[PDB]
């Protein structure tokens, strides 16, 4: 039972996190497993492999750093799906995280 | 490691993480931290529980009650307000009651708090709280972070952490001011090592 104040698509969470940098999650336990750090531009992953956060995301709003879905395998490719698109294909993750970059006012 | 805990993480959002050392602001910072300490602490154990209250702003409030859903956790961050002074003793008394109430009643219990402003109060209110928690079986970690002027803050900290400790379960981090990152100083350390 979801409350009026959380966003779901069926199981899946849908989950904003800022960050200062990405690069806060070089260590962290959680997502360091699937970033690799040296990708330029948005990505997001299409299975839970090491450094699965590869997929380019078309046309990626402002400040937005990545995408990771925690579970699930769904298609992909590059310059395909909109951040909005992505919230379709969750096939079965049950949080989607959403990376956006901080902005200090 | 295989330790099975419940912990409750109490945000300093006071007046104090609005001005000062700027990029991050104090109290971003502070979320990135309990950020990485909840993936740490749910990579630790599956079964482990996190819970996240702020202790200032408009007054205490409850974020999450502890869950092992590390999305759940990130999302109750999202759009914390700041301002007011922390209300410590409450703080520590409503997420005390929150651990009470975990539904795994094998875990073990432990309450994180930011400590990143002025305490207000004296050792001998808070050495009270810190036997009832002793009592009550929960551990306390306590994170002295933020300006580093007012010399009766550490040993109001250090009292507090006195009073609860039980077979060294209960630790405290300086962080300096100044700091390389919040996170970065409490990589090494108790609150995420154990």
Redesign the interface.
């Known amino acids: 039972g979801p409350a009026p104040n ?1 966003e779901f698509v069926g199981d899946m ?8 940098n990405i690069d ?1 999650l070089k ?5 360091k497993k699937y970033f690799d750090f040296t990708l330029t531009g948005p990505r997001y992953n299409g299975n839970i492999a090491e450094f699965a956060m590869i997929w380019k995301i078309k046309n990626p709003p402002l400040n937005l750093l990545g995408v990771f879905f ?1 579970d699930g395998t769904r298609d992909d490719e590059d310059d395909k799906y909109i951040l909005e698109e992505l919230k379709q294909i969750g096939n079965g993750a ?2 989607m ?1 959403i990376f956006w970059q ?1 902005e ?1 006012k | 490691g295989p330790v099975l805990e419940a912990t409750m993480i109490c945000i300093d959002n006071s007046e104090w993480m609005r001005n000062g050392d ?4 104090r109290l ?2 502070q ?2 931290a309990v ?2 300490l909840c ?2 602490k ?3 154990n599956p079964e482990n529980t996190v819970g996240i209250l702020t202790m200032a702003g408009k007054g205490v409030r409850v974020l999450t009650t502890p869950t092992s ?4 956790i ?2 109750c961050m ?1 759009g914390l307000d700041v301002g007011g002074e922390i209300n410590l003793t409450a703080a520590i008394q409503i997420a005390q009651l929150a651990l009470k109430h975990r539904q795994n009643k094998n875990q073990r219990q432990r309450i994180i708090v930011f400590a990143g402003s002025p305490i207000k109060y004296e050792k001998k209110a808070l050495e009270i709280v810190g036997k009832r928690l002793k009592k009550n079986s929960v551990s306390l970690d306590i994170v002295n972070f933020g300006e580093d002027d007012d010399e009766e803050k550490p040993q109001k900290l250090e009292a507090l952490l006195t009073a609860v400790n039980n077979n060294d379960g209960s630790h405290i981090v300086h962080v300096p001011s100044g700091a390389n ?1 919040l ?1 970065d100083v409490l ?1 090494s350390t108790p609150v995420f090592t154990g």
Request: aromatic share 8%; hydrophobic share 30%.
């Open positions: 959380e969470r849908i989950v904003n996190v800022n960050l200062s806060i260590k962290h336990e959680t997502f925690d049950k949080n995280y901080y200090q | 700027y990029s991050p602001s971003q910072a979320t990135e950020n990485l993936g740490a749910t990579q630790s859903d590390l999305g759940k990130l999302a999202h990152a996170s990589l």
